[model samples]
Target chain A: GSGSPLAQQIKNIHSFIHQAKAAGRMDEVRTLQENLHQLMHEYFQQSD
Target chain B: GSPLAQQIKNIHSFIHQAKAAGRMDEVRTLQENLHQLMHEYFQQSD
Candidate 1:
């Protein structure tokens, strides 16, 4: 059910955060989180 | 701001659900809303 590209992208990014945390990569986690916000914001920038 | 963090999580799930259902328009709407959440948080804390 989560096979949609948009869903997959968000889920994939979320998974990256967990993986980074498991490896104690807080920097990577922050980047992933930032990446997510950036992606969301980019959509909005184009939208507006 | 307690609900703010959880609200972001909820919106993320909503976006995933909306997208999986093939709601591209809804996905972008959710994306915009989610962006605001992050933006608001950034202003106060960072």
Candidate 2:
């Protein structure tokens, strides 16, 4: 589904991930990666 | 983690979202991709 809350969350974080990568923020990237990973892990556990 | 391990972790994150979004077509395909990826890499290992 388009524009779901979690979907948007993924998009938002995905953008930040790239930005952090380009900016050479290694620490930020790992934390952001975990954020995305955590969110997705939650959604997945609840999915059918 | 090594480069491939990091990539595998990345795909794990992706597959989670795809499933949460109810994209079984995508989930299945991604799993297959992940499987084949590790499989191929297994061959590349010592």
Instruction: Name the runs in model 2 displaced over 4 angstroms.
Output: A1-3, B1-46
Report clash pairs, candidate 2.
Answer: none
Is model 2 an incorrect, acceptable, medium or high docking prediction?
incorrect
Clashes (N, CA, C under 3 Å) per candidate: 0, 0
Q: How high is the DockQ of candidate 1?
A: 0.08
The alpha-carbon deviation from the true structure for residue B20 of candidate 2, after best TM-score superposition, in angstroms, is 18
Candidate 1 has an lDDT of 0.69
Ten-residue stretch with the least lDDT total in model 1 chain B = B37-46
**Candidate 1 lDDT tens digits, B1-46:** 3466566667777888887899999999998998789688545432
Winner by lDDT: 1
Residue B1: error of model 2 in Å? Answer: 24
Q: State the lDDT of candidate 1 residue by residue for A1-48, as single tens digits.
A: 333555457668878888988999889988888877666444433221
